[PDB]
Design a protein around this ligand. Sequence first.
Ligand SMILES: CSC[C@H]1O[C@@H](n2cnc3c(N)ncnc32)[C@H](O)[C@@H]1O
Ligand SMILES: CSC[C@H]1O[C@@H](n2cnc3c(N)ncnc32)[C@H](O)[C@@H]1O
Ligand SMILES: CSC[C@H]1O[C@@H](n2cnc3c(N)ncnc32)[C@H](O)[C@@H]1O
Ligand SMILES: CSC[C@H]1O[C@@H](n2cnc3c(N)ncnc32)[C@H](O)[C@@H]1O
Ligand SMILES: Nc1ncnc2c1ncn2[C@@H]1CCCCO1
Ligand SMILES: Nc1ncnc2c1ncn2[C@@H]1CCCCO1
Ligand SMILES: Nc1ncnc2c1ncn2[C@@H]1CCCCO1
Ligand SMILES: Nc1ncnc2c1ncn2[C@@H]1CCCCO1
Lengths: 261, 261, 261, 261
Amino acid sequence: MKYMITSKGDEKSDLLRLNMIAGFGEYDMEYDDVEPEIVISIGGDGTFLSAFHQYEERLDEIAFIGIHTGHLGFYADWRPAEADKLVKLLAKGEYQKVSYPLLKTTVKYGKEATYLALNESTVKSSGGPFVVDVVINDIHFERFRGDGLCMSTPSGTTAYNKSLGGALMHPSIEAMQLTEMASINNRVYRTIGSPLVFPKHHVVSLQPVNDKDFQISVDHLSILHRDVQEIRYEVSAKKIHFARFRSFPFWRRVHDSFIED
Amino acid sequence: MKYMITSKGDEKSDLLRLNMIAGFGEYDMEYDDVEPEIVISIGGDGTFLSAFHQYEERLDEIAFIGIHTGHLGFYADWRPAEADKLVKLLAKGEYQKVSYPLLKTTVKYGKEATYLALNESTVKSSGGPFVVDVVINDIHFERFRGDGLCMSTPSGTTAYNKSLGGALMHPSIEAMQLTEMASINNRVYRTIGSPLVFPKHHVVSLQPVNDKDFQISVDHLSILHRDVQEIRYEVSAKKIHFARFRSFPFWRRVHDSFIED
Amino acid sequence: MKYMITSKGDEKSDLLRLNMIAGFGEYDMEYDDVEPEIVISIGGDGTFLSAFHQYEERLDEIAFIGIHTGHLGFYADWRPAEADKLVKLLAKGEYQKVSYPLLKTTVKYGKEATYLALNESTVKSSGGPFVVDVVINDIHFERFRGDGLCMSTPSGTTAYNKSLGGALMHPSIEAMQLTEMASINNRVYRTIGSPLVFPKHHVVSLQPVNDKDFQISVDHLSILHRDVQEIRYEVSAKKIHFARFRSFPFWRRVHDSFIED
Amino acid sequence: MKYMITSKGDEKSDLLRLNMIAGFGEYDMEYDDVEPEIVISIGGDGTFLSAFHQYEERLDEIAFIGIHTGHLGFYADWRPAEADKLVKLLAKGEYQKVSYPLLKTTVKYGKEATYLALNESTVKSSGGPFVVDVVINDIHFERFRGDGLCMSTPSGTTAYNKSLGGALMHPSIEAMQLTEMASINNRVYRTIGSPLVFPKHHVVSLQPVNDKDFQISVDHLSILHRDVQEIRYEVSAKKIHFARFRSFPFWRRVHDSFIED
Ligand SMILES: CSC[C@H]1O[C@@H](n2cnc3c(N)ncnc32)[C@H](O)[C@@H]1O
Ligand SMILES: CSC[C@H]1O[C@@H](n2cnc3c(N)ncnc32)[C@H](O)[C@@H]1O
Ligand SMILES: CSC[C@H]1O[C@@H](n2cnc3c(N)ncnc32)[C@H](O)[C@@H]1O
Ligand SMILES: CSC[C@H]1O[C@@H](n2cnc3c(N)ncnc32)[C@H](O)[C@@H]1O
Ligand SMILES: Nc1ncnc2c1ncn2[C@@H]1CCCCO1
Ligand SMILES: Nc1ncnc2c1ncn2[C@@H]1CCCCO1
Ligand SMILES: Nc1ncnc2c1ncn2[C@@H]1CCCCO1
Ligand SMILES: Nc1ncnc2c1ncn2[C@@H]1CCCCO1
């Protein structure tokens, strides 16, 4: 089919990319970075996130693969020594696909912008204090004062979410998880403290109390948003598709990354 | 239908129980605590847990209701002033039902015993140090040394799980959550630290390293188990059914219990 | 003596300030905001922090007092109804003094700047990733990757330090406490995780790994520092002095703020 | 002087003990396990704790030394290869001493018993729920409901205290630290959550609310206490003395145990 290969850009990843292109040339495979059906990412999870966001308008028509030239990643979970076997099996194309849930962020002004996250979307304040009202399915839940908030996909839970004390959830669960960053708690301000796990179709809305300027991040991309009226989180109806060429279970991947390999 | 009412046993709950029995007598309703189809619990969440476990062999044929005579409970979530309206609507019996997931614990010896938890099942050691091997779907995940482990249902997450830093998950999610109690972590022992959220059909197995005697709890019931070979956790195929007579959303119930009411 | 009164600036605090000035006029007391010996702060703990920093060059010659016109503060811990009794006892001037430790921050470039904190000093990155080497008394302790770090005085421990999971320490202890903000931990990056409590004369040094631009905060003041070579923390030899006019124990103040009042 | 050597009891530690006794025989040193002035512990930190408690009535007249035959301990912090150099320098006896603070626990009935802890003293319930009133210097601070409480010395902070989220404090600080085990927090029960660090002469008292039977631990020793009226914690006036034969800083010891060695 049509395929493309993105590279981290160091010698190791560029040379592996050139060798995989050469290997693909021995098959009925066309290099096309406009309408690829296979997107191979060579580098780390950061390289993989840029690949996902490069092609997030054609998610339904792409199977993603990650190769880690450094340490094992959660998306770049195949070693460079398997690249030749990868080329072979991608060429035949009878592999299977597994799908992970994604997070949809909607930002409203006083106008609207939507974003897909593969790891998480976070909200912080633009210098001053961060106060927002947290609304769950039109129900006012809490007034949060602190550093900010983080909404994670399931596969995002091993990333920023983990550093904030959130739970790791198996990515077959269609959910999103909200974690707090340094919440103020006394007898004036009061937050739940615990991470919150939301199913599909639940809508978490963040509403400004005073200042309406926020620094909003989506995966690696962080930009200052002004005149914000509302930030809405929900599990996306879209999903990322991976080419499956072996059994590498999520919990083993968690074990290899955090316990021992 | 056939119904029964369990009471916490103080004056307040016994008198409310007698008044509801009197109210039920005005309808085609029979009191039967052997094969009830409606089990009303009057007291707190602890009273409700005993009601669930009193009838856990007829879960498929029972709708549960809880009335809190003290503070709002997560299962006893209706006020005594609504008891008359409750009798009325339970008598007609066109109410709807909502189902929550349950946790199945299997304990193997060198023989087998199974238990259903509505909140959680926990494992601790019988005096000495607690060391177990944690196996996830036949994959050795970690060697845990510490005080113990807790496996929570979704509706259990607001209970012991919350005090251990676990996430609160909406009970429409068919999952279980594993949290650590005081894990030892250095460059000898190593655990994941984070709460772990498991979907249906995943099996978490705890296996003894040295001592094989453990104190195992299931909801309020804690008993010493000897000659234990394995403890297995999975989401039960069984579910608890509640009679639904109003909209009291889980997240509002979380808000009213932990934030403000 | 010479005194001055700073005000939060709302009606309530300005009017209390004018009334205390009037009351002071009945005694041998001179208003002087250049060389005061008594600095009264009317507002909240934030107003008190500005008062401290307004006069941090004459700390050895000033006794501070805080009045809270809103909720109880940890530095503004006297109610407005006691202002008349405060004027009386400050005028006679046989009150006693209690001293709290302070935190000295040194920032070195490639030049040097020093700062005193009453609550804490925090270090974060200027947009990009935050990586620093943590050196304790010339001993390399850890390579920290995460959101940032916070070094708190004892009286600062109830503030930002508390939201980061740090311990509350009685301010009679001459120490400083280092807490992490969202540290990355796997088998590549490794931090201690726990808050660290340091005695007098211990020096904690933060050293850049790659990027040398940091956002450094000292109490309420946060400024971007460029070309930073080192950030050094140690317990200051200077101390803040409070006028003591009653017994309001620190632990009771903790109780009233976080448990119940 | 008079010395004695305790051993973990495995081959490795017994043989090292016999060799050190032989080496000591070449000097004016007498083996005496009744009134030793030097107590050498060979094994791990657990062996060292038994040595301390074996001789806790002669703490003022003993310098302790620990040798780790397994992994580095915080009290057993010298390697077996240094045992010959240890014998030499202990024999001459111009070494220096460093002292660590200790924790005094008082248990009152309806009679009194006192205990010294080198690591920590913990309180849990005897099966049923654990509810105690926490009193700080005769001031009621909180009503704690949960699994239990832990009061740690400074050198104890790297042990159980660390697993409960407490801070690590340098043992030159004369203090004790109170950490919670799985506290219940809602709008009925309310605890501070944060670890609490107390200076010398502060007294923390635990008082029963209903049940008066508790499982109290002091270092490795845990015994059921009945008819308990009060548990009192304070920094001991006694101190443990170590023979100092090299520079092995506490923070480096923390680094080697938890970060890398
Ligand atoms: C470096 S690739 C970008 C990812 O880094 C992760 N990340 C950012 N900051 C942190 C942090 N403080 N701790 C852990 N992961 C982080 C987020 O999940 C982001 O999507
Ligand atoms: C009192 S009813 C029994 C329930 O109490 C909860 N529980 C027990 N111990 C604790 C604790 N330490 N913190 C919070 N909840 C607890 C558990 O979820 C149990 O099912
Ligand atoms: C508003 S007065 C300034 C103080 O607010 C405190 N502070 C800032 N951010 C937070 C936070 N996220 N949580 C708690 N306290 C905070 C810091 O201790 C600072 O000195
Ligand atoms: C094994 S030597 C005894 C010491 O083990 C430590 N300990 C006991 N339980 C735990 C735990 N769950 N986590 C960490 N350390 C522990 C306590 O500090 C005790 O003094
Ligand atoms: N989904 C993820 N799970 C775990 N780790 C992740 C993920 N995505 C990116 N990273 C890491 C975070 C540290 C910096 C390098 O990239
Ligand atoms: N599912 C539950 N969610 C929250 N709280 C619960 C639950 N079950 C029982 N409790 C409480 C725990 C404290 C003692 C009284 O009962
Ligand atoms: N030392 C302090 N201890 C507790 N709280 C403090 C302190 N200083 C300032 N604050 C609060 C923090 C929340 C915003 C208002 O000011
Ligand atoms: N003071 C201590 N600091 C760290 N670790 C300690 C201490 N005392 C004993 N241990 C360990 C705990 C795990 C089991 C082996 O002994």
